[PDB]
Design a protein around this ligand. Structure first.
Ligand SMILES: Cc1cc2cccc(NCCN(C)C)c2[nH]c1=O
Length: 130
């Protein structure tokens, strides 16, 4: 229906806003674009499901997220990928892991403060009906 289409449109608007706020944070610059294979050729080898904030925006616009829960799975993926690819004790690796966890924590905190639980439940019930 139109009302359900309106619901998913509000979801996309909400998700773009959250993603924009993550993307403009200087700590998260490394997560804003896909990894350049010329600079890092072994990334595609090690990480089977690459994810970044530009790709999240593309997925929002392609209507790939019908719930905030599905969006958070991609946020979690950005974080888990970073933990996986940068596991060493070296400061470079520890910095990116800390930033990855901060990105995840920040996304969840924004959602906790600004997502109405009943809006998410409506999205989930529309999703499950299809
Ligand atoms: C998303 C991402 C981008 C990136 C770019 C350059 C270099 C690294 N890794 C640091 C090198 N260490 C893994 C040894 C990178 N690690 C990442 O996790």
């Amino acid at each position: 229906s139109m009302q359900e289409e309106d619901t998913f449109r509000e979801l996309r608007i909400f998700l773009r806003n959250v993603t924009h706020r993550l993307a403009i944070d200087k700590r998260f610059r490394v997560f804003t674009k896909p990894v350049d294979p010329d600079e890092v050729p072994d990334y595609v080898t090690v990480i089977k499901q690459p994810m970044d904030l530009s790709s999240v925006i593309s997925k929002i616009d392609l209507h790939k997220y019908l719930t905030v829960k599905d969006y958070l799975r991609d946020i979690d993926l950005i974080c888990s990928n970073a933990l996986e690819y940068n596991p060493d004790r070296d400061p470079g690796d520890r910095l990116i892991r800390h930033r990855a966890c901060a990105l995840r924590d920040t996304a969840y905190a924004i959602i906790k403060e600004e997502l109405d639980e009943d809006f998410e439940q409506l999205c989930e019930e529309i999703q499950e009906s299809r």
